[PDB]
Design a protein around this ligand. Structure first.
Ligand SMILES: [K+]
Ligand SMILES: [K+]
Ligand SMILES: [K+]
Ligand SMILES: [Mg+2]
Ligand SMILES: [Mg+2]
Length: 136
RNA sequence: ACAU
DNA sequence: CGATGT
């Protein structure tokens, strides 16, 4: 329908999938970068999309903001609503960091409330989400 | 089949 | 072409 311009948009970027993962959140209206995570050596697209939403929830909660969050990831939206990231990535020594972050994000969801609406960015109708990394 |  | 996910 209509873009809600008063919102936060988040997205993952990577070098390979699985591969090096990063994510960021931007003001949908202005494009200003509000947060960007230092690259994580190995993760998946969906783990990064999930972390990006949870980071957005935490960022907005700390600022008393009721803005919605846009994500282009059906998977990550579902994982956040379930409070469970059902990733297939092997959990071993190489993937320890991403799994630690995912575990901690789940723990945050299980210990806090939020009213932030989590909305699907409608890429087919509106083009690329404003937090996209432009690598495709 | 659809979302990344 | 490879990959992650519902
Ligand atoms: K996309
Ligand atoms: K991109
Ligand atoms: K598939
Ligand atoms: Mg995305
Ligand atoms: Mg993108």
């Amino acid at each position: 329908e209509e873009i809600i311009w008063e919102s936060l948009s988040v997205d993952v970027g990577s070098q390979g999938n699985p591969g090096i993962v990063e994510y960021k959140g931007v003001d949908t209206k202005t494009g200003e970068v509000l947060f960007e995570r230092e690259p994580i050596p190995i993760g998946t697209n969906n783990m990064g999309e999930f972390l990006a939403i949870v980071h957005g929830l935490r960022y907005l909660k700390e600022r008393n903001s009721r803005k919605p969050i846009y994500s282009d990831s059906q998977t990550a939206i579902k994982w956040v609503k379930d409070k469970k990231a059902k990733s297939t990535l092997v959990r071993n020594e190489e993937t320890a960091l991403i799994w630690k972050l995912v575990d901690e994000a789940e723990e945050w969801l299980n210990t806090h409330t939020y009213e932030t609406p989590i909305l699907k960015w409608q890429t087919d109708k509106w083009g690329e989400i404003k937090a996209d990394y432009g690598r495709k």
